[PDB]
């Protein structure tokens, strides 16, 4: 509401169980959203006292805010413009909550602490380790998957092909060579269940 | 009584019935994620199978509608997302091999 | 169901003195004052429609600007009162039933018989039938007539009513006079009392009355056989707008009325 | 209903534009066009009735609300429906203004002397001046004087 998004249903908060479910009933602890449909949403996690719990909570509220935004649109149109938009708009609300002036305004951070140039440089380096570090890896995975699924490159030319443009495209060399039967870039989680990288 | 009004009422009834089925399936999946039971597994499994059969039926019934006879962008987009092929040319043996 | 309905008679007589009612809700003591309104003329010509009853009669008796109704009866055979304009389930129509339990008053359209009848009885009851029910109204009250079988070795009493339609405020006035004279209307003076006013708003043109006599006990074996062509004495008079002078008592009554257009005296 | 209340139907499409206070109760399968309905048909038979669902978990805009709509009417007829009025206590032997009924009066009140008749409300003299009133609630006769 400091940003400008209005408040929403008061029955949602009791409808979402947030602390540890315990052994009384089996439940997962992955922070997940539930856009059930006609005016009903849930969140699910086990909340602990971590800063990353606050980040994931902001991510979940960004997701559910974007969910209830297009409720007036029909069920076929009750999504984002494409698949990556929803994750992106969750991520920007996730990252924008880590601003210490907001924490000082809301009292999360005491006013005695101050922000310097070197601390900001370290924070930017961590952000580069998280955001721009994964970008060229996602690029070469997407390119290799696109040549694979296009059916253009030969299947048996992969003696060192993925190895060699791992060496020249992103600057990572394998420690041990592998034979033709290996499909290690195709052995990842997303390719194994056909989850795209674009 | 042009084809646009028939497409409109078909889209509306599909939206309502698919909304009900999606609501039931998402509710069952949510309370199963909070409380893991085999009866809940059967619940949203039957709901998802019925919703998959329903979406196949709606796509096949929407195959009659001409996608080039719609000038509204929203109805054209929703029919395009409804007239998807999926298994237009697919042998059952090939489908089960893929699965 | 409906029954034999081709029977008509006629008679003719006069009317001496009756037909004076209170003007409205007002009271005075020993004051002689005048009004100009509807009244039954003194010594006026009336129409004795039918003489005496186990007889059938089917008249089409019209209505115009109020009506004076009079009848003698023991055990109260007369039960039904029907007013209206079309009387064929076309416009709203009056219906008064004066059964010994409670009087029922209902105005709406009705598809009754052209010549309606009510009864056939004992064991079970023959109630109202042969009508349409596409209409809504209600009223119920204590029945107008006094207790049945009010007969002795001599004559007992005579019933009289007047009806007036004005401004959608249908008014009925009545009296039960206990007389021992045994010959038509009695030579004497009395008044008429206001009892019921109904806000309705329906024009009336034709009206009739109903008898609720059991034609038989068993339905198919016995019914009506060789008893028709007649009905009871229920003298009918009309009304004209004229002037009257009335006399009031010390308690407040009406004990003398003199016409204002009869003779030079 | 916790499993969903589907008994609350509503008609999505009517034959023509609605008339003020017009009711559609028939279960006719609404033939939209381009093909006759012919009993039951797939593409163009199109039953227009739709359920409400109505679970207690539904949203604020989706929860079952109950609504009563009221319409009065006036006509050139006696008015059969009105609003009640509460009357204060009545006093005697004081020069007061009063409204015992639709008539409006003013004067000193005194107890009864002359008996009335039950179908009577107004006592008058020979000069058209009202001087006797029966009380509405209590059946007591009162006499007014200027």
Curated annotation (Swiss-Prot), chain B:
Annotated phenotype, changing residue 51 to V: Increases slightly the interaction with RBD domain of SARS-CoV-2 spike protein
Tissue: Expressed in endothelial cells from small and large arteries, and in arterial smooth muscle cells (at protein level). Expressed in enterocytes of the small intestine, Leydig cells and Sertoli cells (at protein level). Expressed in the renal proximal tubule and the small intestine (at protein level). Expressed in heart, kidney, testis, and gastrointestinal system (at protein level). In lung, expressed at low levels in some alveolar type 2 cells, the expression seems to be individual-specific (at protein level). Expressed in nasal epithelial cells (at protein level).
Region (Interaction with SARS-CoV spike glycoprotein), start-end ranges: 12-23, 64-66
Outcome of mutating residue 13 to Y: Increases slightly the interaction with RBD domain of SARS-CoV-2 spike protein
Outcome of substituting residue 15 to D: Increases slightly the interaction with RBD domain of SARS-CoV-2 spike protein
Variant or mutagenesis effect after changing residue 23 to A: Strongly inhibits interaction with SARS-CoV spike glycoprotein
Top-level division of the source organism's lineage: Eukaryota
Compartment(s): Cell membrane; Cytoplasm; Cell projection, Cilium; Apical cell membrane
Outcome of swapping residue 73 to P: Increases slightly the interaction with RBD domain of SARS-CoV-2 spike protein
Description of what induces expression: Up-regulated in failing heart. Expression is induced by IFNA and IFNG. Exposure to cigarette smoke increases expression in lungs. Expression is decreased in nasal and bronchial epithelium of individuals with allergy after allergen challenge. IL13 stimulation decreases expression in nasal and bronchial epithelium. (Microbial infection) In airway epithelial cells, expression is increased upon influenza A virus infection.
Outcome (variant: residue 24 to L): Increases slightly the interaction with RBD domain of SARS-CoV-2 spike protein
Residues carrying covalently attached carbohydrate according to the record: 35, 72, 85
Modifications made to the protein after synthesis: N-glycosylation on Asn-72 may limit SARS infectivity.
Biotech / industrial applications: An engeneered stable, dimeric and secreted receptor with combined mutations that increase the affinity for human coronavirus SARS-CoV-2 spike protein shows potent SARS-CoV and SARS-CoV-2 neutralization in vitro.
Effect in UniProt of substituting residue 1 to P: Increases slightly the interaction with RBD domain of SARS-CoV-2 spike protein
Outcome of substituting residue 58 to T: Increases slightly the interaction with RBD domain of SARS-CoV-2 spike protein
Impact after mutating residue 72 to Q: Increases slightly the interaction with RBD domain of SARS-CoV-2 spike protein
Effect in UniProt of substituting residue 21 to R: Increases slightly the interaction with RBD domain of SARS-CoV-2 spike protein
Annotated consequence of substituting residue 23 to R: Increases slightly the interaction with RBD domain of SARS-CoV-2 spike protein
Phenotype for residue 11 to F: Increases slightly the interaction with RBD domain of SARS-CoV-2 spike protein
Membership in a protein family: Belongs to the peptidase M2 family.
Protein name, entry field: Angiotensin-converting enzyme 2
Species of origin: Homo sapiens
Gene this chain is encoded by: ACE2
UniProtKB/Swiss-Prot annotation, chain D:
Annotated phenotype, changing residue 32 to V: Increased resistance to neutralizing antibodies
Effect of residue 76 to P: Increased resistance to human covalescent sera neutralization
Effect recorded for residue 50 to N: Reduced host ACE2-binding affinity in vitro
Phenotypic consequence of residue 9 to R: In strain: Delta/B.1.617.2, Epsilon/B.1.427/B.1.429, Kappa/B.1.617.1, Lambda/C.37, 19B/501Y, Omicron/BA.4, Omicron/BA.5, Omicron/BQ.1.1; Contributes to cellular immunity evasion and increases infectivity
Region feature Receptor-binding motif, mapped onto this chain: 1-65
Result, substituting residue 9 to Q: In strain: Omicron/BA.2.12.1
Positions of region (Disordered): 12-47, 76-98
Subunit structure: Binds to host ACE2. RBD also interacts with the N-linked glycan on 'Asn-90' of ACE2. Cleavage of S generates a polybasic C-terminal sequence on S1 that binds to host Neuropilin-1 (NRP1) and Neuropilin-2 (NRP2) receptors. Interacts with host integrin alpha-5/beta-1 (ITGA5:ITGB1) and with ACE2 in complex with integrin alpha-5/beta-1 (ITGA5:ITGB1). May interact via cytoplasmic c-terminus with M protein. May interact (via N-terminus) with host bilirubin and biliverdin, thereby preventing antibody binding to the SARS-CoV-2 spike NTD via an allosteric mechanism.
Function: Attaches the virion to the cell membrane by interacting with host receptor, initiating the infection. The major receptor is host ACE2. When S2/S2' has been cleaved, binding to the receptor triggers direct fusion at the cell membrane. When S2/S2' has not been cleaved, binding to the receptor results in internalization of the virus by endocytosis using host TFRC and GRM2 and leading to fusion of the virion membrane with the host endosomal membrane. Alternatively, may use NRP1/NRP2 and integrin as entry receptors.
UniProt name for this protein: Spike protein S1
Organism: Severe acute respiratory syndrome coronavirus 2 (2019-nCoV)
First and last residues shown, out of full length: 444 to 589 of 1273
